[PDB]
Amino acid sequence: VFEGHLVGTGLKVGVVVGRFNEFITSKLLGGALDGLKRHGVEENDIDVAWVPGAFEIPLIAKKMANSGKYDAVITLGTVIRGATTHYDYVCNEVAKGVASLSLQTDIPVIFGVLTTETIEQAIERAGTKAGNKGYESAVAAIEMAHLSKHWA
Amino acid sequence: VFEGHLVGTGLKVGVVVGRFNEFITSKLLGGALDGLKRHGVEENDIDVAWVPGAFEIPLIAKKMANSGKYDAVITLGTVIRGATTHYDYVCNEVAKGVASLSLQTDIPVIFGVLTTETIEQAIERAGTKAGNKGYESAVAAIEMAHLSKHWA
Amino acid sequence: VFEGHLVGTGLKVGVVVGRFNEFITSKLLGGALDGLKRHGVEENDIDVAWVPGAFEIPLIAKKMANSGKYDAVITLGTVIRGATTHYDYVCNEVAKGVASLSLQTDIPVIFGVLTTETIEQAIERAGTKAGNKGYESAVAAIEMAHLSKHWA
Amino acid sequence: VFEGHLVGTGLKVGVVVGRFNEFITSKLLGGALDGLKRHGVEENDIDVAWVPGAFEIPLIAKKMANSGKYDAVITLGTVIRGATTHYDYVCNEVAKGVASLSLQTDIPVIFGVLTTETIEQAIERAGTKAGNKGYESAVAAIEMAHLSKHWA
Amino acid sequence: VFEGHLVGTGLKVGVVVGRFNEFITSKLLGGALDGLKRHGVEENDIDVAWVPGAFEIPLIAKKMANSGKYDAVITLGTVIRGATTHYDYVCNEVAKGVASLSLQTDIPVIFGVLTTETIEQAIERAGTKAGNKGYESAVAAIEMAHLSKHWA
Amino acid sequence: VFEGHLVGTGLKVGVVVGRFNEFITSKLLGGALDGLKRHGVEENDIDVAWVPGAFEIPLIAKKMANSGKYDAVITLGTVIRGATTHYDYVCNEVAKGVASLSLQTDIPVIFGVLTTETIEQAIERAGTKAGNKGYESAVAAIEMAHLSKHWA
Amino acid sequence: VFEGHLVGTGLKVGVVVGRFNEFITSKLLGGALDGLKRHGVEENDIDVAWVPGAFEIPLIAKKMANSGKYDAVITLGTVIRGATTHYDYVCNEVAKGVASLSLQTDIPVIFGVLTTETIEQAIERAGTKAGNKGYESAVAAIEMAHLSKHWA
Amino acid sequence: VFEGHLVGTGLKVGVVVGRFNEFITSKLLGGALDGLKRHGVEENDIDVAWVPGAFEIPLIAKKMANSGKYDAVITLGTVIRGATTHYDYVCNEVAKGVASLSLQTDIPVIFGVLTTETIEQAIERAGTKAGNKGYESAVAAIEMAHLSKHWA
Amino acid sequence: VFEGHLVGTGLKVGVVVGRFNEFITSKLLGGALDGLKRHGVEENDIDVAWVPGAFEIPLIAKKMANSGKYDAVITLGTVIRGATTHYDYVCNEVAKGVASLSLQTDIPVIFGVLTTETIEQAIERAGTKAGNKGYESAVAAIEMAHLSKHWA
Amino acid sequence: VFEGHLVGTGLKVGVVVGRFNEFITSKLLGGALDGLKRHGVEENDIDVAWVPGAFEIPLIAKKMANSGKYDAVITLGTVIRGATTHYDYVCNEVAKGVASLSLQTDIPVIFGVLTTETIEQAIERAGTKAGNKGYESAVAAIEMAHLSKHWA
């Protein structure tokens, strides 16, 4: 009874990508832009905020949701396993932040941060075998934008 | 003593299903009808919201309980182990959302999200030798909503 | 040196028991509902709230503490390992809502939910080798109750 | 399309439980005698017939269906592997008299007799991991009852 | 509720024993007396029919229940695994007879035929560490006959 | 030839059950308190004495036989192997006071205390594979009672 | 029915502890106070007798129950496996004394002597993951003394 | 630059200790005395709150620091690995509570709860090889107290 | 509240040593005498009775306790493992006798009989690595003499 | 009773550090500052003496404490295993000197010389996992200083 439209010609999205692991987040962003752009979203109704890395993505995502300028916010980034458990707390707090601070703002905030073990797994999901996580995040932002933003 | 009825003659239930793994969630939403319906709930008093996937189920599950139109909100979806720990942060936040944000609404929000390791296990719990976890999550939904009398 | 009493001559206790795994939670309730009685708490001053299972125990346990009718609330239930990580998110959220979440009320909420690996392990704490964890969770309730500092 | 109802507001149910392995059949009966109650079937409109064990359940189950006092009869019992093939002939004849033999009456007779290998397996269906097969056999009774075509 | 007495003060029981394996069935018929007798049944109200072996126990067990002289008919005998599958077809038909032809008589016909793999197992169940299956089949006989009140 | 009766129409029985391992002793008592009832012993002529555990069963069992109010006293309890030899001294002293120590009274005292190795073994005699040893210990009580020679 | 209170408001308990293994018996006597005390027993109504070791605990435990000053006598101590069978004859006689000489006094003498194989096991049962066997032996002491009403 | 003082002459401290694992938490509380004492704090100018389990610490640690009574609150307790994952949900929520609810008050709440795998590891950190983690959490408490200083 | 004095200047002890294994009992006695002597006991208030071996030590120990001349009796001896189980019954009856016949006389009778496996274990405990069991028995007799003989 | 104070406000301390293994002894001297400082001692009211090797410490540790300049002298240094037994004669004589020649002066001389096998073990005890054994030897110095007290 309540499906979400997938055409976002009149939408207005804003994304926050993490500079760390640029090698991956780059192609990850281009896929999200390409997605929104070719789904109707105007090529300039789209803003991008570069943060130091995923840990920083919850703070600035909240600053773009509370700015009340966008119809949806897309969080992009990439985290890869290291030698320490540092990778765990980062990955957690990013999702923990993006998810929890997506209800505090009743604004669709799509979580599109890669959390992998191998550099080959990131590439795998940045426009390779698995597809482009970024593009898939945009197509998700548009849908949420029809079901969650202008819907109440 | 404070048991809860199982006859939902005059209840209004709202369901939120994730499209990802539709192969499972589809026959898992078969717990809605042939479940709520056979227990009394009216065909028309049941609304369904399709979200992109489990991560987006806390937000829309909120904007359905807060609409005050439903006595209880059933949350459906399916998540299966990948190669990355991405599966973990998702399952966590879905459960973390449906739970921690079921106390802020005082409205019963039944957690019926399959979190499995195999496609086979998801099938085992969607109408096979474990039964349908969508039908069971409805029975629980009725009882819960029907148990909120020492409330208000 | 502020310690807690242990005789509950005039106490008002409320219990929330999960129906799932009734085979265990049954004897588990009888442990508390017989530890309270024999500790001087009235057999007629105890209320029991049957919820579907543990995941629903935070919600109903809240509406009993917020009910402002009990000095302490005991939460009884049983969760046993499955084949999926479903077991983890359940245990977590139960021992998370019940767990310290319920500090908000400032009513004692004793966490007495069995979280085991084997049906044989749960049966060990259900009134066997390790003793009845329901009885022990009632003794904890009386003690917690008899601890009075109030915020104001 | 002739399907079956599931609310049993005005139902007349009869139960035949085998005393042997009372440790299991006990909780097994409580499953049906609590699934019926909470499904709207009268706590005062249920009769229970204790037979020595399963082998005698076909005979007494017959004199209850032939009694023409119940819309459906539930058969509860438990049989566990021994060292001899004695277990086989018992299980067979129970799930043979009860089983389709009792078509002659045209009164619904639900076969809810546990036939397992381990005491731990029977304890799994007695209200644990696999759920209470007595509760499920009561839900089946209500449904079967609410299926009315009559031969004449 | 429909339990069955265990005092057979004024009952009339008829027993049918197979000669084959007399070594076992003999001390197995010791369940008749020192069983029925000690439970009240009169010494004289007990008749015994010796048949060639178990296969011939359905026929003669029939011409004893149909004589309407006995409140219940106890069937005794012993069968042990051979080298051929002959053991199977025998045990089957004995149980198949005593059961399927206990509904056509409405008179309780207790099945007390040992079906084992070892001479040792037959002994285990004729008055050794498993007890006497003839004495147990009498206790059941009394209760059964004593339970046929919602009959006729 | 002085043998013992088995119908206890007019009997006065007393039972001492150990609370420890209530999970087993529970069903274990129900075995005796249902074997007595169905053997013609009054449901209203049975007293039960709950002691901490088996070690205390000799003392309280004494004050019931010395009470001179019962024809026989049944002792129910359960003790299971631990990591220490503590289990041995308990079992010993229970089956030593209860055991023949209580010849002094000349009142029948039936030793029905389970002394096993596994929780699964105790559960076997608690009304499963091996039968209910409480029921059997009641049948022994009635028989012992019906044995009258008196010293004087 | 003859249960026993757990509130020892007006009881007089006497404890007998063995010095040997003071490292364990010390924190094991911590079951006396913070045990009897928290259950009601008066600080002053509790006397303690220090004996050389467990072997000397039957004699002095006798000259405390026979003084008729205490409602119940708690016996504490610890014994651990050596290289010789000396450990056996000790544990035996301690238990043999406290038991067999608790019927000659009619006064509840709770046996709370640790009989273990490891220093670690003694610790496990003196306030670690098994709890404090001194506190448990007090709870039992209260109930026992509080259960001697069908006495005298 | 803002270092924290270590001489706590004029300080009011509050301690919350868990009764479970008293064998360890006892000597662990020995960190309060012979700890706060020698650092200047006034003899019993410090209050100690005994709570049942480590799980109950967060609640009472609050209702002490909640309203100005102390300049800093210390939490002491011990938790040791069991067979079940119960150990995890306890440890987590204790640390979770003491930490998360040390920001809401703004009054220094030092986390001093031992979380070990072995009883030998608890002893290892209760005054053994690693020192006393109670005396160390006291030093921390004083330093943190002297850091309520704000900034310039 | 009831500790035992350790100075026995005015005491009057008597011991019974077993001649068998003189090689050990010798140094075992000298340690007991040396102990009593250097603890105050007058060097002539001390008597020694040589019995054939440990089995004989219960009889003559009773003859020295019933002689009402001593303040305590010390039983010394040594038993070592042989090829037969003879060693077991001897060791048992000695302790069984000394302990049981220490309550029949309400007179402190210290059990100091070595019960070992190796000749090297006896020497080990006769004034070697483990100390002198005899000396330790005297220091025990003196204490019991203050708590048990002139105390009542 | 004579405990040692821990607040060293008005204290003069002297430190002798070894230059060899400066990489470790450096951070080890960090125990002086941020150690004596926070315990009350006045900023650079403490003198530091740098000596070539740990072997030269005893001499200069003397010619400092030798004549009243400080209330206590701390010796810091590090020695790590080599291929030769040279490591032993150094460690020994350092400890030998600092100890033996701490009685002749009577002025507290705390021994704080690391004697490890690995460079990783030195780091382990220089501010890592085990803490800083320099800050610990400072606490000791203050306490020992406050114990120049003599006796009454």
Residue numbers in the entry:
A (entry chain AE), B (entry chain AA), C (entry chain AB), D (entry chain AL), E (entry chain AK), F (entry chain AV), ...: 2 to 153
The authors write:
The BaLS monomer is comprised of 153 amino acids and shows the typical α/β/α-sandwich topology of known LS orthologues. The symmetry-related α3 helices of each pentameric ensemble of icosahedral BaLS surround a central channel. The central part of the channel wall is formed by the side chains of five Lys97 residues, creating a positively charged patch whose charge is compensated by the side chains of Glu94. 12 pentameric blocks make up one icosahedral particle with a diameter of about 157 Å, which is rather similar to the previously determined sizes of icosahedral LSs [160 Å for LS from S. oleracea, 154 Å for LS from A. aeolicus and 156 Å for LS from B. subtilis]. BaLS was crystallized from phosphate buffer. In the resulting structure, we found electron-density peaks at the 5σ level in each of the 90 active sites in the asymmetric unit. These densities were interpreted and refined as inorganic phosphate ions. The binding mode of the phosphate ion found in the BaLS structure is very similar to the phosphate-binding modes described in published LS structures.
Catalysis occurs in equivalent active sites, which are located at the interfaces of adjacent subunits in the pentamers. Owing to the absence of the riboflavin-biosynthesis pathway in animals, the enzymes of the pathway are potential targets for anti-infective therapy and riboflavin-biosynthesis inhibitors should be exempt from target-related toxicity.
